[model samples]
Target: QGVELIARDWIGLMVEVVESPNHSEVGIKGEVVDETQNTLKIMTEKGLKVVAKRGRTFRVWYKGKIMRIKGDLINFRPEDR
Candidate 1:
C-alpha cells in the first residue's frame, strides 16, 4: 500500500534524541509503541520506557526518513504539527 506516513503514526519506528538531560543520562531510543500528551511509550533493548516530550529535541523516523524537531518548535502533538 502506498499510504502516506506521518510522525504521529509512530508505531514500530525508531527514535532518538541528543538534546535532553534524559538523553545524556539514560538515552531514549527504541520502537514507539504509543504516545500521549507529552508522553511516549517506547520498547527498547532494555525494556519499556515512558519518556516525557519536554526539554529535549527529537528525531522521528517515518517511512525511512528522519525528521529532527526541537521541543520549542513543535510544542504540540505530532499530528498537530
Candidate 2:
C-alpha cells in the first residue's frame, strides 16, 4: 500500500530520515525536489542534495497518513509501479 502511494506522490513531499548507513543527522530533514529510481534530490536548509534511495529509510506524510518506508522495498518507478 505504501509503495503504490509513494510512487505517485513522493515528489514534493516532506521526508524525515529514520535510518541510513551514515550521516543520519544530515539526512533527517528535507523536501523531495527531484527524484530518479536511484536517488532523491531534497531541498533542505543547507540547500539541495541528492540522496540515494537504496539501503536507506524514511518517514513520509501524505493525505493525512504517515508511513515509514525503506528505499529497497520499492523496486519500480511511479509510472511502472
Candidate 3:
C-alpha cells in the first residue's frame, strides 16, 4: 500500500451572493444531491438556483448583480491564515 497527498491554492476567486425572499431561519430544504465537492446546489421556493463553492459565494441568477451573502460566511477556507 502507498499514501498520497495533494496541495493547492485558492486566490482571486469570485463569489456572488444571491438574495431570495424564500430564505428563512430553517434554511433551504431538499437534499443537495449531485453536487460537486467544491460546490453547493440550493433549490429555493421561487425557483432560484443557488450554487456556492469554496472561496466562492452563492448568487441568484437574473435580477441584476446584487451580493446577498458573502462567500466567506458559508464557504470553507484554510485556517492557517
TM-score of each: 0.66, 0.79, 0.27
Q: In terms of lDDT, which candidate is stronger, 1 or 2?
A: 2
Candidate 2 has a TM-score of 0.79
Q: List the residue pairs that clash in candidate 3.
A: 15-57, 18-59, 18-60
Candidate 1 local lDDT, 32-77, one digit each (tens): 7976657668888888887776776667777667777555553457
lDDT of 3 by residue, 1-81 (tens): 001101112222222334433344124433233243344554445453445443443432222342334334434432321
> What's the distance in Å from true for residue 5, model 3?
23
- Sort all candidates by lDDT, best to worst: 2, 1, 3
* Candidate 2 stretches greater than 4 Å from native: 1-3, 24-26
Instruction: State each model's C-alpha RMSD to the native.
Output: 4.2, 2.1, 13.9
Model 3 scores what on Cα lDDT? 0.35
Between candidates 2 and 3, name the one with more favorable TM-score.
2
Question: For residues 1-81, could you state the per-residue lDDT of candidate 2 as single tens digits?
Answer: 574665584788888777888775445667888767787778888788777778788888767788888877653565665
Backbone clashes in model 1, listed as residue pairs: none
lDDT, candidates in the order shown: 0.64, 0.73, 0.35
